């Protein structure tokens, strides 16, 4: 797939707002993911034990990962589709070490779109959401093709 420059603009305009508070957005997104799809919490051997949203909000580790995650995602979006190099090391650790099925990357994509829609309604109207959705589908498709070359396709 190929996003037009206009679509990338809509994606990088609402991303510039996320970047004013990377850690808070990281928290929101992961919690939304763990409340909606609890099974995903099992993949984190470091968080696993958290029983409630309050415990999640108070975990420094969960907040640290959220920052790591969003920083990596932001560096991939700013490439505007030329993200081959960034995707290699990511695909290898998620396919071979963590073992994150494609389906879970769809779950966090949904959590990302839920959180932008709540926080940024004015910069996240229908067209901007369709463009973000296009940019995360692109990301999932290229990661899935790399999973396959690596022997996982999960
Ligand atoms: C937007 C998608 C994602 C991005 C950009 C992303 C990024 C990362 C990055 C940069 C790291 C650290 C370096 C590495 O291990 O490769 C990481 C670690 C990890 N990620 Fe992902 N990730 C994504 C989605 C997920 C999802 C959906 C899950 C699981 C339900 C997952 C589970 C983890 C785990 C288990 C680790 C290790 C955490 C720790 O113990 O240090 N990732 N991810």
Curated annotation (Swiss-Prot):
O2 binds at residue 65. It comes from Physeter macrocephalus (Sperm whale). It is found in: Cytoplasm, Sarcoplasm. Belongs to the globin family. The keyword Transcription regulation does not apply. Residues 2-148 form the Globin domain. Its EC number is 1.7.-.-, 1.11.1.-. This is Myoglobin. Nitrite binds at residue 65. Monomeric. It catalyses: Fe(III)-heme b-[protein] + nitric oxide + H2O = Fe(II)-heme b-[protein] + nitrite + 2 H(+); H2O2 + AH2 = A + 2 H2O. It comes from the Eukaryota. Keywords: Cytoplasm, Heme, Iron, Metal-binding, Muscle protein, Oxidoreductase, Oxygen transport, Phosphoprotein, Transport. The modification Phosphoserine is found at residue 4. InterPro entries: Globin, Globin-like_sf, Myoglobin. It is an enzyme of class 1 (oxidoreductase). One of its GO terms (biological process) is removal of superoxide radicals. PROSITE patterns: GLOBIN. GO terms for cellular component: extracellular exosome; sarcoplasm. Monomeric heme protein which primary function is to store oxygen and facilitate its diffusion within muscle tissues. Reversibly binds oxygen through a pentacoordinated heme iron and enables its timely and efficient release as needed during periods of heightened demand. Depending on the oxidative conditions of tissues and cells, and in addition to its ability to bind oxygen, it also has a nitrite reductase activity whereby it regulates the production of bioactive nitric oxide. The modification Phosphothreonine is found at residue 68. Heme b binds at residue 94.
């Amino acid at each position: 797939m190929v996003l037009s420059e206009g679509e990338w603009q809509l994606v990088l305009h609402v991303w510039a707002k996320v970047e004013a508070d990377v850690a808070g957005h990281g928290q929101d997104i992961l919690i939304r993911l763990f409340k909606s799809h609890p099974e995903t919490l099992e993949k984190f051997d470091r968080f696993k034990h958290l029983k409630t949203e309050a415990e999640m909000k108070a975990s420094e580790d969960l907040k640290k990962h959220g920052v790591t995650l969003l920083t990596a995602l932001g560096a991939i979006l700013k490439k505007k589709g030329h993200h081959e190099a960034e995707l290699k090391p990511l695909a290898q650790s998620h396919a071979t070490k963590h073992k994150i099925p494609i389906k879970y990357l769809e779950f966090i994509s949904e959590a990302i779109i839920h959180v932008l829609h709540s926080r940024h309604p004015g910069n996240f109207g229908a067209d901007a959401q369709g463009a973000m959705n296009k940019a995360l589908e692109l990301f999932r498709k290229d990661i899935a093709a790399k999973y396959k070359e690596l022997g996982y396709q999960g």
